[PDB]
């Protein structure tokens, strides 16, 4: 019958970094999958022996998509190792830059990385812009007119008629494709908003630079707090607040309504891409030394048992190498980590990736927006509960819909909406604290000769941790365990498929030469291979 045989997708585009996905398909459905990360840099090797204060500048260059997040994780890690308790204002400013990062990151992911799996941009040219404008105005309080959308259509028409399709060259939707479902008018609205998002994200990123010097790769964190005395001024706070407000409006008025319209059209995608286990670290602390003080709390769930959320024990993480291109087969806790590259080529000695395979109590764990949202929901988080219930009700689906590619994509929008609102709460608290006369942003500290430290960040892709062993006041060991490592790393020495590999089993493939269904699931995890491998 249908296709039986291998499919390889190399490069996987519209991700960060260098990913090769291999699947075996039987009768048009995926029966096996391998997640192969094909670039190694070795930042952990490079850090050895250096000044712990330098680590955040190197590790920030783990990734420029999730920029700032590694600087924050390393600074939390060295703050922890030195035993410094940073001032309240440093926590606020660090938290505000992080909230801005999530909004930038998720908006770009949905439009610029994910949406071409679901939107036929060329079909937008046949749409009726008056009909499209009525649809757009019914899903958003933002009023869109026929002329608004005709402007987009005319621009796209001129682009396509030049024959230079640029980033749309060889798109899987060109010519039509059976797994693309949208009508012309919905394709035109999504395309209009893709283009709009290209300029809105400039403002979303600018918000990070107001306090954080620049985007990408911020430069305002130090051990002990932050450096940006200008961030205390009413002028910088007003500039941030105006950019945040505009970004939140876009989230609420453009991204979430689009996400819901697309999800409604692709409701069969509730049936693919599910996973069993979830881990999240919590984010936006009131207390840098207490994860349970975070607005989102840490937690662990096995086999979708959300009635029995397990506390997160940081000692139950081990990183496997048996199916990775490193020496040997021994899993290691990151305070005893090892990064000893040894390449065997694809499936040589059963090894096929430069990512290690993190396991929690021996199990493969999804992390990222779906873990953060589901675990916060199950902890009774009122804001997460209110918008996930509203999203479920709009879509007319039950909560089991969330254990899927569609649900993961929706969770990314839910977390964006919730964080966009919480950034305003954080901003008010920050303003309040300045008004009490607290203008301190950095605290003094001393470097110990020997210490261990760990820093935890829940980044846009999930639980990030940096682990340091200080020896003679220098980096004796520095290990990064990154969200995409959890999600997209390979099998472990118990041969358990990782979340992305397992989630791919059962994927239908209508056309093996244009396997957009594989990209829909892989992209729903928002892979970052520079992150996962470092």
């Amino acid at each position: 019958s249908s296709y039986s045989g291998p499919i390889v997708v190399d490069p996987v585009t519209r991700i960060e970094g260098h990913l090769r996905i291999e699947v075996e398909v039987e009768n048009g459905k995926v029966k096996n999958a391998y997640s192969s990360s094909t670039l190694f840099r070795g930042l952990e090797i490079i850090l050895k022996g250096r000044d712990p204060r330098d680590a955040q500048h190197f590790t920030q260059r783990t990734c420029g998509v999730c920029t700032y997040t590694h600087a924050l994780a390393s600074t939390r890690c060295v703050d922890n190792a030195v035993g410094v308790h940073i001032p309240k204002n440093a926590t606020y400013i660090r938290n505000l830059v992080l909230g801005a990062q999530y909004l930038h990151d998720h908006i770009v992911h949905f439009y610029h990385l994910h949406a071409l799996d679901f939107v036929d941009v060329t079909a937008a040219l046949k749409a009726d812009p008056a009909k499209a404008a009525k649809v757009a105005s019914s899903i958003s309080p933002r009023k869109t007119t026929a002329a608004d959308l005709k402007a987009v259509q005319d621009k796209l028409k001129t682009f396509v008629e030049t024959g230079q399709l640029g980033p749309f060259t060889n798109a899987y939707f060109l010519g039509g494709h059976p797994a693309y479902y949208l009508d012309p008018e919905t394709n035109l609205i999504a395309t209009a908003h893709y283009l709009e998002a290209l300029r809105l994200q400039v403002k979303a990123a600018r918000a990070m630079a107001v306090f954080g010097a620049k985007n990408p790769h911020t430069q305002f964190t130090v051990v002990g707090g932050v450096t940006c005395y200008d961030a205390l001024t009413p002028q910088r706070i007003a500039e941030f607040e105006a950019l945040w407000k505009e970004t939140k409006a876009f989230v609420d008025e453009v991204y979430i309504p689009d996400l819901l319209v697309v999800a409604a059209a692709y409701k069969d995608w509730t049936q693919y891409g599910g996973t069993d286990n979830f881990i999240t670290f919590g984010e936006f602390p009131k207390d840098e030394y207490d994860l349970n003080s975070r607005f989102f709390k840490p937690g662990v769930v096995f086999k979708r048992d959300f009635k029995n959320i397990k506390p997160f024990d940081k000692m139950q993480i081990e990183e496997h190498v048996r199916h990775s291109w490193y020496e040997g087969a021994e899993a290691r806790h990151p305070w005893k980590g090892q990064t000893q590259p040894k390449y065997t080529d694809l499936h040589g000695d059963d090894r096929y990736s430069w990512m290690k395979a993190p396991r929690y109590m021996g199990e493969p764990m999804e992390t990222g927006p779906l873990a953060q949202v589901l675990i916060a929901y199950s902890q009774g988080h009122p804001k997460v509960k209110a918008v996930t219930d509203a999203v479920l009700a709009k879509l007319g689906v039950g909560p089991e819909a969330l254990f899927s590619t569609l649900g993961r994509t929706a969770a990314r929008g839910i977390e964006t909406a919730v964080i966009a609102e919480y950034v305003g709460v954080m901003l008010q608290e920050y303003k309040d604290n300045i008004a009490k006369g607290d203008n301190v942003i950095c605290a003094p500290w001393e470097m110990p000769k020997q210490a261990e430290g760990v820093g935890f960040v829940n980044a846009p892709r999930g639980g990030l941790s940096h682990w340091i062993r200080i020896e003679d006041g220098k980096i004796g060991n520095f290990q990064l365990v990154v969200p995409s490592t959890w999600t997209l790393g390979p099998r472990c020495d118990k041969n358990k498929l990782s979340p992305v590999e397992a989630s791919l089993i059962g994927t239908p493939v209508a056309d093996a030469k244009r396997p957009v269904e594989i990209l829909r699931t892989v992209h729903s995890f928002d892979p970052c291979i520079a992150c996962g491998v470092h």
């Binding site: 585009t13 519209r14 060889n170 010097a213």
Partner: protein
């Protein structure tokens, strides 16, 4: 993907963190939509292109072999150790990919310190043998214009492309092959804290009242005096730059800065 009227750009990703690609998305006046729809034809770019896998490979071959010619923009260092094995795309080493494609380009721009000078993965002990593009490909005659920084100011990329399209040639380049129109001044000579430097008014710590008052960050490690870039002039995101945020320059537009400029908090 191309042919006609807009100049073709092939954008390659080697050993990189994608911060340089992100920096281009921050392009301002012109913005990135103007750049991709009006100015240029972006014919290959793994971060945002629609095609994947074989379809993406075919898009790349069509662009590189075009009789109309293409410009290459390259992000990331080339890993050369172990015969290039540490970095592959479509199961080809990055070294082989770049060796085959870049000699066919009408012009090559190395964008970001990794592509220009080797960058973060080339820092000691350089396990993957990462090299900048011109070092890696010297023997093939490749001479990329180097636009340095980690990441660079995207103003400097668009300014170099526009110059090239107008004048059919590279602008004046310094001895590191960087355009002098952007890299001809130290960041220090342009810095607002220079009067404090001259007066020997240095912040002794980040928590100090001197730091609050905006005194010079040289004692806290600032590499402004040895770094060529236009940061204080152009700023980033139309609003800020490191020492206006209170933090020293870490020298990120300079070759080997990860080893030359460290420890970052010492001078």
């Amino acid at each position: 993907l191309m042919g006609p009227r807009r100049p073709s750009v092939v954008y390659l990703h080697n050993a990189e963190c994608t911060g340089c690609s992100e920096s281009v998305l921050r392009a301002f006046e012109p913005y990135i939509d103007t750049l991709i729809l009006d100015t240029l034809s972006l014919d290959y770019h793994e971060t945002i292109m629609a095609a994947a896998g074989d379809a993406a490979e075919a898009a790349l071959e069509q662009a590189v072999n075009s009789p109309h010619g293409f410009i290459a923009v390259v992000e990331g260092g080339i890993p050369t150790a172990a015969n290039g094995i540490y970095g592959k795309v479509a199961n080809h080493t990055m070294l082989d990919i770049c060796s085959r494609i870049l000699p066919k380009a009408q012009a090559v721009i190395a964008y970001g310190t990794c592509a220009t000078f080797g960058g973060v993965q080339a820092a000691k002990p350089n396990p993957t043998g990462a090299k900048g593009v011109n070092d890696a490909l010297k023997h093939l005659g490749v001479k990329a214009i180097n636009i340095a920084g980690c990441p660079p100011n995207p103003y400097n990329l668009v300014g170099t492309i526009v110059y090239y399209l107008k004048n059919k040639a590279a602008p004046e380049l310094d001895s590191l092959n960087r355009p002098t129109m952007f890299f001809g001044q130290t960041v220090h000579e342009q810095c607002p804290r220079l009067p404090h430097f001259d007066a020997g008014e240095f912040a002794p710590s980040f928590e100090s009242e001197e730091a609050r008052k905006g005194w010079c960050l040289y004692e806290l490690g600032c590499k402004g005096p040895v770094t060529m870039n236009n940061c204080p002039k152009i700023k980033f995101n139309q609003t800020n730059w490191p020492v206006d945020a209170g933090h020293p320059c870490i020298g990120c537009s300079e070759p080997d800065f990860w080893d030359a400029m460290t420890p970052f908090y010492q001078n």
